[PDB]
Amino acid sequence: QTTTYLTYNDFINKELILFSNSDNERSIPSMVDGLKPGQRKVLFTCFKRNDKREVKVAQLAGSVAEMSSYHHGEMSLMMTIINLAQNFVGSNNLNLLQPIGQFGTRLHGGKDSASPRYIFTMLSSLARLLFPPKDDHTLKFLYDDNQRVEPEWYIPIIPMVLINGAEGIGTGWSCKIPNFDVREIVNNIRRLMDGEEPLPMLPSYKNFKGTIEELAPNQYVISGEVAILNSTTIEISELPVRTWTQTYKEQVLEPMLNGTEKTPPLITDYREYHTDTTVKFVVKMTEEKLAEAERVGLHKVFKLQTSLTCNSMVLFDHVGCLKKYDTVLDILRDFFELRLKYYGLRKEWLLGMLGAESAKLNNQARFILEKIDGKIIIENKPKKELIKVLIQRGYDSDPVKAWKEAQQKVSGPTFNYLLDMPLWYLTKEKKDELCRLRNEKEQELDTLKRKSPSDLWKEDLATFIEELEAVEAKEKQDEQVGLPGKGGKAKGKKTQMAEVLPSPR
C-alpha cells in the first residue's frame, strides 16, 4: 500500500535477509546432486536436446538462457560452462563436458582459456549413465516464468560432492570439500549395500604423483616431487595441488634468483622443461647451500609441503535446511539412504506405466482385428455415433492421459489414438510387427514384475565401471600419442619427509 516512511529495523529484517538467503542458495552446493543452480540449469538444457554432434559454447549459453530461465548475464554463465569441462590436474577428477579445444592449461590459473566462440563442447558418454533417463518423473520441478523448468536436484549413482569437490563462499556459512577417488567410492557403496561397515578414505586426485599424509582428523598434508641429480644440480618434478606454475615461478624462483633485502641470492641458475601436464625444473646452486638445505629439509626450502583442513562441511538437505557435517562416512550413509528410498518409487512408476502402454497396444490391436473382421463400419458415420458404438465395446480412453492425470492430482471420452493411425496399419506386414511389439512389451513388464529394485543399482554400477574403463583408456592414449619418446629423462634419488612434530591443535 502507500508508504510514507520506512523503519531501518523493518528495512533490514525483511529485505537484506532475502539477499542473504538467495546468496546462500546460489553459492553453496547440495549434498544430493553436488551441483549449484547455475550448473544445474546448463546440465538440464544439455539434457533437453540429444546433441549427437558438437556444439558452440556461445549458442549453448544462448539456448540455456532461452530455456533454463537464466537471468544473471551470459558472461557469468560462460565461465560456469567452462568450469564444468576442465579436466587438468587439480581441477576435476571427472568431467561432464568433453574438452574440445583449449579449456585452459595448468599454467595461468585456468583463466588462459580461449574466447567462448573459439571453443566447442559436447556431452560426455558418462553423463547419461550417471543420470538414468527414467528418473525425470521421480523428481519435482518448478514453474518459473510459467515454464516447465529444471528440477531442484538430481539423483546420480555416486555422491557428486565427493568426486568433484565443492568450494564456495556464502553468507554466515562457507563450503570447502576436497576431491576423492571414484573407485574407492564405488567399493564403499558396494560394501555398504550388502550391510558391511564402510572403510576410512583419503582425499586423492586423478593424474597426481605427490604424497599425501594424514596427521589429525580432517587435516591433511601434500608433498611434491624433488630429486638430486648431481652434487650441484636439483630437479623439481611435481608441485602440489592448488599451485600454478606461473604463480609458483613468480613467487619462488624470482625472490630466490636475486638477493632480497636481507638474504643473499640462494639459487644460481634455473631452467624450465614444461609440458601441458607435467613440469620439470632444473636448478643449479652451490654445493654448500645444497648441504644446508638437506640439513634443514628440501620441502621447507622450496615450499613443497602444503596443509589443508576440513571444517566447512556445510551443505543443503533433501528438505532444504543446512547441516554442519563432520565425517565423509556420514555423507556416504546419508546419500545411501536417500538413494535407497527411491528404488520403490522408480519401480512403482515404471510398473503400471509399462502395463498401461501394453494395454494401449492391446486395445489398438483389438481395434485393428475387429476392423479386419468387418464389424466396425466407419464409412460416412458421424463421429458422435462412432464414439457411441466404440464405447459399448469396452474400449477405454488413453491410459497415458490417465497416468498424467493421476500424477497431476497431487472433455468427455478419448478415442483419438484409435483413429489417428494411417491406412498403412491395415496390412498384415504391419500387423505382425505390432503383435511382436506388444509381445516384447509384455515380456518387459513380466521381467520388471519379477526382478527386484535394489540389484538394479549394482547393475548400473557394473555398466558405469565398464564405460569408465574405456574412458580412462582413451585418456591414457591421449598422452601416449603425445609421448615424444626421445627427450631429456633425468632420474635421481628421491627424498621423502614428514613434519617431525604433528603440532595437533
Partner: protein
C-alpha cells in the same frame, strides 16, 4: 628511481606477458627465434606446443589486434603506442641504425621472427601490416631470411582413423570435385586457433617442414 635502475640489465622484465627464451640476448642469438601471435588465445596454443620443441630457440609474445600503420602517421602517434615500444624493446632495433653486415644482425637479441595467426583474411591483413612496419624503417633486413610464417589447417576430415589436412578452400573444393565416396568423412571447420587440441598442436609442431 632505484626500482627503475634495477629494471635494466635483466633481459626484458618490463612486461609479464612475455615468455622469454633461454639464450635470448646471450650467445647464439642469431638462431634464437620469436613467435608473434594475434590476440591472446593463440598464446595458449603456442605455449602448449612448445612443450615438445623446447625453450631455447623459441619465445612467444602475444599481440593486441590491428597494429598501427607507420608509413603515414605522426611521430607523436608513433610514440603514443606502447605495443610497438614493447616490440622494439624485446627485439632491440634502433631507428637510424643501418643493418648491412651480419655483425649488425648478431647485435640483436633474436635471430628470426615467426608470425602465426588465423587462416582467414584478418590474419593476412595483420601479417601485411607487420611486413609494412618492418620494411618502412629497415629495408635491409628483408634480404637475410629474418621473417617467417607458421600456418595451420582450416578444415579436416575423419573416417576410420584417417584424416586429410587442407589449408585453402580451393584445395578442399578440388578434393571434393576429384574424389568419389564424398561426405562419408566427417567435415569439421576450424575458425580460430583455439579450436585445436593438444594432440593437434603436437602433430603441427612435429611436421615443421610443412608449416
Amino acid at each position: 628511481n632505484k626500482k627503475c635502475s634495477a629494471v635494466k640489465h635483466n633481459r626484458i622484465k618490463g612486461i609479464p606477458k612475455l615468455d622469454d627464451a633461454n639464450d635470448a640476448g646471450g650467445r647464439n642469438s642469431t638462431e634464437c627465434t620469436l613467435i608473434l601471435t594475434e590476440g591472446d588465445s593463440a598464446k595458449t596454443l603456442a605455449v602448449s606446443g612448445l612443450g615438445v620443441v623446447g625453450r631455447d630457440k623459441y619465445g612467444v609474445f602475444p599481440l593486441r589486434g590491428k597494429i598501427l600503420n607507420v608509413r603515414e602517421a605522426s611521430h607523436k602517434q608513433i610514440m603514443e603506442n606502447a605495443e610497438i615500444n614493447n616490440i622494439i624493446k624485446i627485439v632491440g632495433l634502433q631507428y637510424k641504425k643501418n643493418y648491412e653486415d651480419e655483425d649488425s644482425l648478431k647485435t640483436l637479441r633474436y635471430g628470426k621472427i615467426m608470425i602465426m595467426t588465423d587462416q582467414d583474411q584478418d590474419g593476412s591483413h595483420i601479417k601485411g601490416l607487420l611486413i609494412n612496419f618492418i620494411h618502412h624503417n629497415w629495408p635491409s633486413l628483408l634480404r637475410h631470411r629474418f621473417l617467417e610464417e607458421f600456418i595451420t589447417p582450416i578444415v579436416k576430415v575423419s573416417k576410420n582413423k584417417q584424416e586429410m589436412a587442407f589449408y585453402s578452400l580451393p584445395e578442399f573444393e578440388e578434393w571434393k570435385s576429384s574424389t568419389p565416396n564424398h561426405k562419408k568423412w566427417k567435415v569439421k571447420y576450424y575458425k580460430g586457433l583455439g579450436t585445436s587440441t593438444s594432440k593437434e598442436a603436437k602433430e603441427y609442431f612435429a611436421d615443421m617442414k610443412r608449416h
